[PDB]
Every structure is written in C-alpha cells, then in structure tokens.
Amino acid sequence: MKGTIVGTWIKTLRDLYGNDVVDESLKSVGWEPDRVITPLEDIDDDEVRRIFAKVSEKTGKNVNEIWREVGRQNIKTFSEWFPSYFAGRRLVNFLMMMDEVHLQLTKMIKGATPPRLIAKPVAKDAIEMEYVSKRKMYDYFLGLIEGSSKFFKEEISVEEVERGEKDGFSRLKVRIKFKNPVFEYKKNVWGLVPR
C-alpha cells in the first residue's frame, strides 16, 4: 500500500481508537519501528493485516468493524490533512468526484492501485455506488460513506444492491438513499438534475 494513506490509518487508529498503548504496541512494537514515511513513499502490506488483527484481538472488536470505524473517522483525518476537495460541495458531488479523484491521485504515482468508485444518480433521493478492487475492503468503503454523511451533515441509508467478481476483481454495489432529495426534474430538461 502507499505511504500516505497508511499515514491516516495509524493517525485515525490512535486519533480516537483504542489508545497509544493498544496499537502503539502493534505499531512501534507490533514488529516494526515508530512511524511510516509520508511524502509519496511506499510501504509494506499484510503487516497492516496483522496489526489490524492484533487490534481486534487487543480491543474486543471484530477486525471488520475496526476497518469500518477507521473509515468513519478517517474522513475527518482526511478533512484535517489537505482538504481541497471538501470546500464547496454537498454530499453528492463529493461522492461523485471520488472516482476521478482516486485516479488522479494515482496518475503520476507509479504502482498505485486505487479502487474504482463509480457513482450514478438513480432517483431524486438516491445514487448507486460501485466499489471495484483487487482488495476487498468492503468495510472501509462503507465507513467512508457513513463518515462522509457525518462530516457534511446529511442523513442517509445505505443498502447493498449486489456483489460479485469479474475478471479478477471484487465488486460491491450499494444504493445510497438521501433523507432530503439531492436531484430534481427541471422543466424542459431530461433526467435527474442536481438540484
């Protein structure tokens, strides 16, 4: 995985989740020393896998929930570190850029393997999002979405539409329903218009 994002995981992981004791043992004493790189440096793997397991072991939490919770708070952590993307959007626009954004992030960033996050309006109060990846981080994906609902303060329901595997990738499609509709029909204009 890439250096930066792994930054947040540890940040968000200690920021509010268990203490510096629970994870600073898996972290600066799981097997490794205290601190990733940051700039755009690379990192390892599968060690995130086992620190997360030892956090699940360490707290009383299934590891999938650890992941989800990270995703929730990791949206503020994201908001804190370098938040050009937040300024000026409602929830929807923000989700819909996320694909373009994950690509850009990887454009000139060799080796990067970010997910695909294709969204599509399906109703005055609903979009559909599809996560596609060789990793199956379904829980982190769900959390981010809820973490977003919280930061932008717009209530939602999320529901799984389907899931599958195609050409070696894992997919998960969800339907995100908004409390207050985010699209509208405009008079002589076809289709759901971003109200």
Element holding 11 (H helix, E strand) = helix 3-15
Instruction: Tell me how many degrees the CA angle 51-48-1 measures, rounded to the nearest 5.
Output: 170
Does residue 145 interact with ligand HEM by CB under 6 A? yes
Does residue 2 interact with ligand HEM by CB under 6 A? yes
Exactly one of 89, 120, 135, 195 binds ligand HEM (CB under 6 A); which one?
135
Task: Choose between 75 and 192: whose C-beta lies nearer to ligand HEM.
Answer: 75
* Eight-class DSSP state of 108: T
Segment lying near ligand HEM (by CB under 6 A), choices 1-9, 33-41, 45-53, 180-188:
1-9
Please answer whether residues 130 and 170 qualify as being in contact, where contact means their C-beta atoms are separated by less than 8 angstroms: no
Helix 3-15 vs helix 47-58: crossing angle, to nearest 10: 10
Task: Choose between 54 and 68: whose C-beta lies nearer to ligand HEM.
Answer: 68
Q: Which residues are annotated as a binding site for heme b?
A: 2, 78, 102, 113, 131, 133, 135
Exactly one of 43, 112, 118, 123 binds ligand HEM (CB under 6 A); which one?
112
Beta bridge partners of 194: 183
Segment lying near ligand HEM (by CB under 6 A), choices 17-25, 29-37, 106-114, 151-159:
106-114
With H, G, I as helix, E, B as strand and everything else as coil, classify residue 43. Answer: coil
Does residue 98 interact with ligand HEM by CB under 6 A? yes
Does residue 89 interact with ligand HEM by CB under 6 A? no
Residue corresponding to tokens 């289709």: 191
Give how far Cα 73 sits from Cα of 15, 140, 151, Å: 9, 11, 9
Interactions with ligand HEM, residue window 68-87 (CB under 6 A): 78, 85
With H, G, I as helix, E, B as strand and everything else as coil, classify residue 195. Answer: coil
Give how far Cα 174 sits from Cα of 27, 49, 96, 148, 149, Å: 33, 25, 14, 15, 15
Please report, as ranges, the residues that interact with ligand HEM according to CB under 6 A: 1-2, 5, 78, 85, 95, 98, 101-102, 105, 112-115, 117, 131, 133, 135, 137, 140-141, 144-145, 148
